[PDB]
Write a protein that binds this ligand. Sequence first.
Ligand code: ATP
Ligand code: SAM
Ligand code: MN
Lengths: 279, 590, 136, 370
Amino acid sequence: MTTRMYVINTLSNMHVGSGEVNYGVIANLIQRDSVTNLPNINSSGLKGAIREYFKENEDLVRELFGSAPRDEKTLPGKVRFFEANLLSMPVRSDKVPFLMAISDEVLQELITKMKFFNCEEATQYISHLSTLLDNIKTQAQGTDFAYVFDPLLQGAIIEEVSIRATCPSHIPLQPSLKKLLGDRLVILSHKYFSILSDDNHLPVLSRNNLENGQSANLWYEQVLPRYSRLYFMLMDGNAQSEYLKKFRDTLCTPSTIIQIGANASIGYGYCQISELSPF
Amino acid sequence: MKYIAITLGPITRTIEMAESTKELWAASYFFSYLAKKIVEPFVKKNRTFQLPLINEEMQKPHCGAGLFPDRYIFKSEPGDLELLKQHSDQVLIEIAGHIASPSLPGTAKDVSQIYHYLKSYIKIYFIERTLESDDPHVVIPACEKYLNIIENQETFPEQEETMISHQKSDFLKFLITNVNGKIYRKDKNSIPRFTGSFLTRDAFGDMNGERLFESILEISASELNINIQQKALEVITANEKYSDQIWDAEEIILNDNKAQLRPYHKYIAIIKSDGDSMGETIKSMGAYNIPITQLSKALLSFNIESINEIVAYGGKPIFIGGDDLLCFAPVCCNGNNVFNLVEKLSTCFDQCINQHLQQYINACSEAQRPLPSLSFGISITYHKYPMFEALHTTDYLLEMVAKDNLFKYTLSNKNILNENMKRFILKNKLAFSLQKHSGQIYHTAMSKKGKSYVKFNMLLQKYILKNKDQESEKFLSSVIQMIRAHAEILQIILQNEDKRTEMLKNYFDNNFNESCHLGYTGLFEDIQTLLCLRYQENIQDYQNRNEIIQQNTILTSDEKEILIVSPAMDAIHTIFTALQFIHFINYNKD
Amino acid sequence: MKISKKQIEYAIEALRANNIITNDNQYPKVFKGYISSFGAAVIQSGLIPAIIFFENEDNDANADRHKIIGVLKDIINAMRQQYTVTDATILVSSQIPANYSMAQYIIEHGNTDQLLKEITEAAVAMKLALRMYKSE
Amino acid sequence: MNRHYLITLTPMDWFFFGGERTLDDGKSADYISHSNKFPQQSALLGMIRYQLLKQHNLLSQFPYTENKPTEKEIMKTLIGEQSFRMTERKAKSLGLGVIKQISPLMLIECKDDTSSRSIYFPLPLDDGYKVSFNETSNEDKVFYNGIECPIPNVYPASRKFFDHKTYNNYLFWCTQGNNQIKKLLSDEIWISKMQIGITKHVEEGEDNDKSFYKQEFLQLKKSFIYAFYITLSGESELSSDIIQLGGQRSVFRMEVESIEENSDIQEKYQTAAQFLTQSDRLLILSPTYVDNLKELSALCNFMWSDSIVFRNIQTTNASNFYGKPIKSSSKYHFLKPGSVLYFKQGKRKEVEKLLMDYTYLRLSGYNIYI
Ligand SMILES: Nc1ncnc2c1ncn2[C@@H]1O[C@H](COP(=O)(O)OP(=O)(O)OP(=O)(O)O)[C@@H](O)[C@H]1O
Ligand SMILES: C[S@@+](CC[C@H](N)C(=O)[O-])C[C@H]1O[C@@H](n2cnc3c(N)ncnc32)[C@H](O)[C@@H]1O
Ligand SMILES: [Mn+2]
């Protein structure tokens, strides 16, 4: 009945359009945070996607998300949606197809956000993540780092930024932290993550428009890689317990897939919303 | 002696109040009308004017453009103060009456309420200084600074009731919104006409050709000899305020003319120009003994010739007064481009400066001092793109880039302007931006001082297709992507001082080494020459500026990188933007 | 990929240093074909056979084909000079000795994935930098 | 009996404060919606009333009701019977319930050494310049729309004259330092982003392709928070919670801190503003309203001022609350904070009497000067 953390875990490519005026080759760019330039989803897009999924359940939509745009009478929604910040991203590797890349700065920002928002299971996650971050800083000692926690993953190569994965044996990764951040997790410096998540390294796809075999238009598209993880905060205010429980159970159902992003018909931005499990 | 200086009008706010081209024109001409009516008694009483040269020609209607500025310095005999006060009150009472209930779409109006609103809104401040010298060079800046400080006193209406229609209090936007009047019908087989307000009948005259402006498409697309406004008016009046309906109908009518429709017909260009350091020019004409009346003559002649050129090209003059110009013109019509119009305007300004300021031109020639010049800001946008955003973009271009006010503003906010840094202020620039319907935005800046501008204009003239008539020069679109992709290599080539031209020619020959490219040697040579000229001008203008900016310790790294411009990359971007504009004009989705 | 300006600069300096371009910005015509064929040979055959074929002196060719291998070695040396020396990095920054044939270096310095990537990038840089000059 | 609190608002996300919504009226909306840097005092008062009605669980939920007239009476004596309107701008009492006095909203900087707070005010429009108003008489007289005024001779306090090409006081905010006045740019305080929004076209219905808009969202710098002072009468508890302030469901966090008793919040605000005092002029600290600007202009030689727009959402104690709210039929213009009034010789008390004649606005947080 308070602020809750949700994880997105996109199962496909995701393209949430900024609508910004492009200065380069990529016509369609993805939404990025103003301050940190990390990929993000606007709260309006999150609310739109979740309302689209639940649109059939009219009472739940009216109670939680509010009235329709054409409704003759307006009811404010009881649920407040926040921005979805990038948690982890898949990066190309050599021993494995990919690794889930996280940075120290995004971990610190997540800790600050949970402290500021006071999530449901905030305390244990804050304590364990703070201990992990302090151990990481103790082992790094001001140097650029890339730490794997699976012993088999030692010596892994991040392809885009040519760095090698080290294994600190005295830094334990708790199972809940693995469930939150992902499997085959790599913790590296935020400079490496910023380079990996910048415009020159995010996947760019060429697209065509053909009329009777003649190309009408050409443009390039930017997408967020599949299996990337994003987190947002949901504030319910104080909604009906039955509608809120229905919303949480439907969201956490393994068979529930939410479409966030532009290209729905060609399978862009299908995700599985998770809840912060108790530690 | 007994000089009088008059400043009037919250021009920026009223221009902000317009969301359409016709509303912008009405707002701009409202203040010209006010100034004309305010100053016509003093001109009729034949007193010497030290600022604006008010002759018979400026009082005549000139294609619906406002030639009357907002600042007037005026020599007054005793008895002009209360005369000016009473005339200001009377010219508020009139106009308040003129907006009461002519053939204007509305319900009813209270003359006293309109007069109160106009008095609370329209700024009318005048200063009667007692100076000791009759020299214009002394009286003009001394009164100008006091006018500048006078402009900071704010007067506004306290209450604005706008609801239940018939008790309105915002009448200026009623005037600008309803300036074409109410479209009136009197027959089943005739041409519907606009019952224009007092502004239209004072601006556009009353002698035929009375197609008053309505929606931007008619000048956005005026080369097809299609009376789009007549068809739009007949379509609107065939069924059943009206600005949106006319805009939609005009768009549809332009859509059924796909046969001879080119993509630039839906794009509109905004032109803004200001005088490059007119105050320092006046100081120079104070040092060398040249009267300022010659400068006023040159400015008035340039204004008249610029109005004529804008009308001949096919655009619309919004405001041309003093050193300031605002024009709405088609991107390309009847074979001429926007940049052709800009070149013509620059040529007209130079011709008027030479004709009316020959003594000062000769003095500054051997003295090695800069001459008066025009900085230009051009914005081309989709017709549906917000006009406020387009005007803000044009202002940003002109002021910040073309007048180099980014450098000066960043330096002054940190209080490091000094004088050696002031030596690096660059004028005589052309800022141009084209934003597509998808927001691709091509922007560049160029210096009109050297031959790079001439070569740019010649390239545009050469490689832009003319309408079907005998052959053109066969522009090649593959060079656009080559320059973008090979930009760093071109920078490396440009940085080689001894073998720059040979390396550029060799690179273009070796990349475009196929049989088809034998017909594009002229294009390759032209772009090579333009690139070399632009790089030379850029290094001359910006090298020492970049070194001193980097050597500065106060400025932050981000502000340093914003202020620092790379000469080679800037030249490459200019070539890229020129080629993109050529391709945009040339290509049509058949 | 995208064109690397620093590698183009290294290619220019190595082409000048290995006596490919004369005092005038001109080179013998066959070197264009040499540079273009080197990458295709590297892909189709192995890296070692291609380096052996192009590094081979006393061959019957219209010009000095081993000069391109010299240019490649110089570019690789410049790249390794510019490499960042940090822990948890993959690249080895030791320069290739001037008394060493490239074939011998690749022979006794195996696991040559980094060397393969460097050689391909240097070949691309050589191809793109040779276009600034004219063929006699 | 009269407890005074200090309320600090921390922006938990991007916030949006509504503007005029239009440069005209009728049915038109604004494609570009811009965000005011500050909320109206009406927004603060309504937030206080809503939070009080949340603490004492008396809320207007689901369609419409009449609210049990005994509950109507208790809600009247709690929050008043009426919203903020400028019709009662000369009333000697706020007319609300337990709410008595609200200070103008302050920009407070919180440092790492969280023991002291820095209060930031807009830079006075005359800062760094000297204005003289030479009175040798018969020299030169300004006529501001036909009223006599002495000529405003102005010089930088460092001669030359006012160069409006270098005038930039309107871009700066200021705070007290143990030396000179610290100038902070508005850019360094507020971060602004423009968001594009559409309604997804659900077919088999709607003519709504027309749903397309841009909005401006403002974010405060990490060390900056909003704050104001409130006086609550008798038995009235204000608990820290999560509140709504501004459009688009902008969310904030209250910290309710009870300062020592027998304190005057007006005196606290004026003590904060003391460092900007100049004896030859009046500095407008909060949006000031005068019914007629003519008398004010007659009372001073120069009005280096600007104007802001005001329009309140007017709701009765028992209103619909689910529908288009009724807004003040009249759009009102206030004097922008940081404006300076250079009065004539003497007559400072006359201008002060004119300004404090509207005690209702003074209690709310408007018409405050130093
Ligand atoms: N008709 C005119 N005759 C003489 N001077 C004029 C005339 N119109 C305007 N001026 C001069 O224009 C000056 C104001 O110019 P403005 O502020 O537009 O910019 P500028 O000095 O031309 O250049 P910039 O914008 O680069 O600073 C005044 O000092 C005034 O003397
Ligand atoms: C930005 S305003 C500043 C002062 C303002 N003109 C006033 O009197 O309050 C100055 C600019 O307004 C423009 N301008 C002046 N008179 C105008 C008019 N009648 N119509 C349109 N623009 C005008 C010119 O570009 C001039 O340089
Ligand atoms: Mn000007």
